[model samples]
Target: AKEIDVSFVKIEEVIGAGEFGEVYKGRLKLPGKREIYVAIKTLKAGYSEKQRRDFLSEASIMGQFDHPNIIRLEGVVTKSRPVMIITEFMENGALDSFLRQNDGQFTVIQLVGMLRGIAAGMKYLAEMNYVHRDLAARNILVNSNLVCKVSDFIPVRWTAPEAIAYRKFTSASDVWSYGIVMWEVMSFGERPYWDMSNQDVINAIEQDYRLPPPMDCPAALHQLMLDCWQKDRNSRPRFAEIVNTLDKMIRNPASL
Candidate 1:
């Protein structure tokens, strides 16, 4: 993708702050075309030159992916005064906050529905030669149908240690994070490694520690996550197998 003309994007109001700068709920309009609401992530040019260049590069990377469960990039505005990223807006927003906001009164089957949707998305990424390696619950967005779509980012808490240690990013490392996402969903978005600093997590993981199941979590579901967190990366289930497991879960909610 190339630099987008800033004129196509219309700023509405600030939503919150992202790592780079102010984030907004905005809109995208093409000549004689209808407008659609968008989530706008801005890195004001005042940021250091390195930061300014970084977001535009990431914006280019965003346009390459196409999947229903993966959040889509609407456009980018690198040619303008304040550079921006425009992406489809999900009203229900991030999965972590969505679950927490409702006190997670949803059925166990409902959570599995969300989980499987993510698994279906990950399965596609894993099958691709070029895949986005970072996966986290905070990056998944929800819609009114309770449908979910995701983007990728790496917070130390969600990253696999081997990937950190060797700077190696692969689907296996993503599987490691997917297990953590399972834990986050199981725990209604509670902090994954409670009170663990970045090094605390790395050191603990090195010592063979993995997350425990939340109260009321099904044994079968917990076992799936444990399989994903296995010390031998090769022991982890690939995304297709994960999808198959969930497909079975969906078929038999009486087991719930």
Candidate 2:
């Protein structure tokens, strides 16, 4: 299941831009199996051989994980031109994009459901001992069912200060990023620190300034956000605590 026959994949069209090249909504067909839609990350021809090397490497890395909240890699197409990394298609696309269109239209409980899945995914990655340095709304994919499945790093603003500067990307650092994601989600995809330059974001964080809550955002959730963004990185709450808290919030009507 790791290596897919390129012949079975039918690229439909470009869906969006990707790190390697264009992303596509593709079709896959295998005998005795139901056909399904897939999101394909294609490594288009000729630019830097360096790009090709890493694209394939991540495609290889993609095969290692399996979780409901994590974006699944369907297979890889390495033997063909414009090598591709095929993954489960999210009809709703990226989390930020999806939420941006909706504009916080859902209930607090609905919002918490999305956060619950995302937190669970982050928790899984952390407990598995993989340090996912980048955790942002943009990196999470939203399915037609509105599930936020884990999937990047044009994430300067989402990252922690010490981690960004010292290159120490611990789980604590990731928790900082998760806090940013909370704000991003709560705001329904409002740009973090809107209109601030990346340097300004760094300056503000150094000054101990934190982002304000989104309109009508749950104080409880905002408290968790602040917890994740603790200046002493080691003091930040772990994802297991985050998962537990979200679950509790889910069960308690007034928790939010």
Candidate 3:
């Protein structure tokens, strides 16, 4: 882990907060008097040893990945009062809010383009044998170019049925969560399964219930989502298959 100088970091504002700590929008001063915007995930004061380890684990995982569609970890500030993990600042923020703000403004191809970027990122991770285990639209960040980059993970209500039932996390479970992400993107950030409670969602999946096609979602795309939601984990398509599927859609818009 690259150690960053805490004194050189200027916190601009708090962008997000959770049990772990707050995520700040900040600027990092470099050696040549240059500076760049960054997102900093701080460690809450008084964190336990295990909490600290869990917090830094994401940074260690990100350190191995270098891809356009994956959020880049700039560095870490571990010697300071509030340890922090610094990452590339995403101008457009989370994909869900970005899409909600521009609801109905994007064409089907544009949406698929975003999905393609996510699948490409996942494909890279899958190739690395890194299962996201918490893939979702909210975990994706968008840039000024409208490019999507998959970000850090925190298990959410969108977790796969198998994960809910057996705490089993595999590439196939990640694929299942990717299907929920597809629904979110297609529906312009609509919550998966609407108002269903967490247990209700688990039960619904236990009964073989799947989310209906999003409003105006392409038939082919919905079918792909269904494939991801297959009850049999082995039946789910791999991330490579998802990338190919999106590639074909991008290459042939008529199929949408």
Local error of candidate 1 at residue 184 (angstroms): 0.5
Query: lDDT per residue, candidate 3, 127-214, as tens digits?
Result: 8998888688888999888899998743546777778778789998899899999999999999887788777877878898988999
Weakest 10 consecutive residues of candidate 3 by summed lDDT: 152-161
The TM-score of predicted model 2 comes to: 0.94
Query: What lDDT would candidate 2 get against the real structure?
Result: 0.87
| Per-residue lDDT over 152-254 for candidate 2, one digit per residue giving the tens place of the 0 to 100 score | 4147888998887888888888899999999999999999999999888988899899999899998999999999989998899999999999999999968
Alpha-carbon local distance difference test for all models = 0.82, 0.87, 0.89
CA lDDT for candidate 1: 0.82
C-alpha TM-scores of all predictions: 0.86, 0.94, 0.91
Ranking by lDDT: 3, 2, 1
- Per-residue lDDT, model 2, residue 149, is 93
Taking all chains together, the TM-score of candidate 3 against the true structure is 0.91
How much is 199 displaced in model 3, in angstroms? 3.3
Question: Where does candidate 2 stray beyond 4 Å?
Answer: 47-50
RMSD of 3: 2.1
